[PDB]
Amino acid sequence: EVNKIIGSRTAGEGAMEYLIEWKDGHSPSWVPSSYIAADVVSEYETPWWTAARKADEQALSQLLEDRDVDAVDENGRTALLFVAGLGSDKCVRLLAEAGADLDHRDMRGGLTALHMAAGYVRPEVVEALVELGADIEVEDERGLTALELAREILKTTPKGNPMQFGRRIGLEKVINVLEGQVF
Ligand SMILES: [Mg+2]
């Protein structure tokens, strides 16, 4: 008896709830995602995930009016993780300013936005997350901080062509930022 979904929120640990405009006229109220049709939920969430994967700052800003900054997908990713991995410091800052949990861990290894930024070699995003107050000591399921992950990826990166050489330079910048080195 859903007319439309008119809002989203996180609940508890890792759950989503939706604000429902009811067909029969009862005042809108919050229900767990499981109480209503999967297709109506999926169709409501789509523009959010599209905006995050496009690092579309304008669309994220508009959608935030009614939706939770920390909406999670099936794998426990929030928009912050998607835009951090893509290297969008503009969208990282937008979402942080909107109240995103900077320390959110996913369910595909327990990675944070800082692990995504370190692993995809996004030094400006690592800088931004540190500035904005991410807890750099948060560990993934393997017990690795973002700094330890960056060092691991550096050790597995060969030195053989100019693109690989450049990747190593970016990883070294990630490492220097997380170590708190003087620039
Ligand atoms: Mg350690």
Written as one string, the DSSP assignment of 99-152 is: T--TT---SSSS--HHHHHHHTT-HHHHHHHHHHT--TT---TTS--HHHHHHH
Is 156:107 a contact under the CB 8 Å cutoff? no
Rounded distance between C-alpha atoms, residue 83 and residue 95, angstroms: 9
Residue 13 known to bind ligand:
no
In the three-class reduction of DSSP (H, G, I as helix; E, B as strand; rest coil), residue 24 is classed as coil
- CATH 1.25.40.20 corresponds to the domain 38-183: yes
In the three-class reduction of DSSP (H, G, I as helix; E, B as strand; rest coil), residue 17 is classed as strand
Resolution in angstroms comes to 1.5
| Identity of the residue numbered 168 | R
CATH 2.40.50.40 domain span(s) along the chain: 1-37
Q: How far is the CA of 49 from the centre of ligand 1 (A)?
A: 33
* Measured distance between the N- and C-terminal CA atoms of the chain, rounded to whole angstroms: 59
Q: How far is the CA of 155 from the centre of ligand 1 (A)?
A: 16
CB under 8 Å to 136, separation ≥6 — which residues? 114, 130, 145, 146, 147, 178
Q: How was this structure determined?
A: X-ray
Rounded distance between C-alpha atoms, residue 170 and residue 120, angstroms: 10
CATH 1.25.40.20 domain span(s) along the chain: 38-183
Kindly report the CATH number that applies to the domain delimited by 1-37.
2.40.50.40
Rounded distance between C-alpha atoms, residue 69 and residue 152, angstroms: 31
